[PDB]
Design a protein around this ligand. Structure first.
Ligand SMILES: CC(C)c1cnc(CSc2cnc(NC(=O)C3CCNCC3)s2)o1
Ligand SMILES: CC(C)c1cnc(CSc2cnc(NC(=O)C3CCNCC3)s2)o1
Lengths: 276, 276
């Protein structure tokens, strides 16, 4: 028996309520729709880790989670020019660890964004909202505008979703943590491709080819950018150079060049950081 | 030409972006879908007042608004036990003034909730999100779970929407401003009717009759509450007694007994308060 304290969130995932056990006074988040609740519960049972939100119990279907005090979106609102470089590295390390556990379990998250990065009172980052996650050994949801800001160009172009594009989202979040700004804030899909090339240069031949084969863009003008800026220039005086290197290998335009989790966690940036 | 700074919000209303004029550096909220954009723009032009969000311009259809620094939802998160009694009265007065202008223009808002109460840097409350507002002289959207917490019982029961139920929502917000707690937090429609009667007593005969005639509730158990608590008891030591009187006349179960705007703004609670 839970007393309802408030609404945590509502969307494609459904409705999450902030609740309190009438006996223990513990605060929880209870997820119900009105679907993919059972899929999420299965993945949540598989995915147990310090950087993944804990599912505490299920009943009649409703999922009861640990309630977490904040997300990254609120953190960037309180610190609109970025967080300290130490905190940028700490949060990206923790996020990478959570994605690593997902990927080792053959699960791709598909919706990494500041909104689903919970930051506990002890500053522990936790990933949530597996309502669009997929197991690659099966078959097969999606989201809104803020959720394309973190999407790789090949996905904007319609490629299949895999471990690479979760790594892309990590890089976008790395940048935004460092200066508070969305890195590729398109106002539409096309303006997103422009912003991406304005930083990283022209998409590889194959992505442009998808641009002309994809009827979403029929008759549309390709956003050619003459003079790309570069991330070194984009983040000069913001990221230290080692972490900048890590971000350079998360944001390779060709998904085949992107570091996956094992390589990310082995990067020099996190050498002293893994220990703590 | 606007540089995109971030996403303000996304929902049934569409997508609102936080943007900046490349020339003036003014921050604005730009509303676009992907419908009722034109309806909203018409109402926004009619509805011009200090407690209603200012629409600044329209182009190609996109609506550019003043950007406002916070909403009431964030205020209740920062002050989870309520705001000072003076601030409760000040915000409810301002909200009532905004609804009064809407109602005098034959417009009912239909979605009053903390999320659409903007509170400026000068502590000026502004109403927004007229994407579900209606003009009573015409014909005819709706929302989520948090948006039924502010719905009158006759509306939960399926009555038509009118000025009365906007007054109901005002009362719910009055209570929640005073102690930080949603007043009627149902987990479903039925639990909402229970919570309402647990405070205000049994619904009038006619609302119960709608309960049995409405197939939404076919075969369902009516939430009979034996011992209602009362608002005097519910808010003892929280609301002063004069404002408690105003809340008693906003939360009459029979919509015919509720104060409308003219009566609210004439209540003794706001006698010294109107002047400032
Ligand atoms: C986040 C998204 C809507 C979602 C899908 N599924 C779940 C359930 S898991 C959760 C446990 N604690 C949570 N904490 C937060 O989101 C809070 C609320 C926002 N302000 C403080 C930070 S949500 O959330
Ligand atoms: C609110 C809702 C989504 C909506 C529908 N239509 C509009 C456009 S009008 C606006 C102008 N300023 C605005 N300010 C706020 O909501 C802010 C953002 C949240 N944190 C700080 C408070 S929204 O908003």
């Amino acid at each position: 028996k839970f007393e309802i304290l408030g609404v945590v969130g509502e969307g494609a995932y459904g409705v999450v309520l902030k609740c309190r056990h009438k006996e223990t006074h513990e605060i929880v988040a209870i997820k119900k729709f009105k679907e993919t609740t059972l899929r999420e519960l299965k993945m949540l049972r598989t995915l147990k880790q310090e950087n993944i939100v804990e599912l505490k119990e299920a009943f009649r279907l409703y999922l009861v989670f640990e309630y977490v005090e904040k997300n990254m979106l609120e953190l960037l609102e309180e610190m609109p020019n970025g967080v300290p470089p130490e905190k940028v590295k700490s949060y990206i390390y923790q996020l990478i660890k959570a994605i690593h556990w997902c990927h080792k379990n053959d699960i791709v998250h598909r919706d990494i964004k500041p909104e689903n990065l919970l930051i506990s009172h002890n500053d522990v980052l936790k990933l949530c909202d597996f309502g669009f996650a997929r197991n690659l050994s099966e078959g097969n949801y999606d989201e809104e505008v803020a959720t394309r800001w973190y999407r790789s160009p090949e996905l904007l172009l319609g490629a299949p979703y895999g471990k690479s594009v979760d790594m892309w989202s990590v890089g976008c979040i790395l940048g935004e943590l460092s200066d508070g700004q969305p890195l590729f804030p398109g106002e539409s899909e096309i303006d997103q491709l422009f912003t991406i090339q304005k930083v990283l240069g022209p998409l590889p031949s194959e992505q442009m080819k998808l641009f002309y084969s994809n009827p979403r863009f029929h008759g549309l003008r390709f956003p050619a950018v003459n003079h790309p800026q570069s991330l070194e220039r984009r983040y000069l005086g913001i990221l230290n150079s080692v972490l900048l290197d890590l971000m350079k290998n998360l944001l390779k335009l060709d998904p085949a060049d992107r570091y996956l989790t094992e390589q990310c966690l082995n990067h020099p940036t996190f050498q002293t950081q893994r220990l703590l």
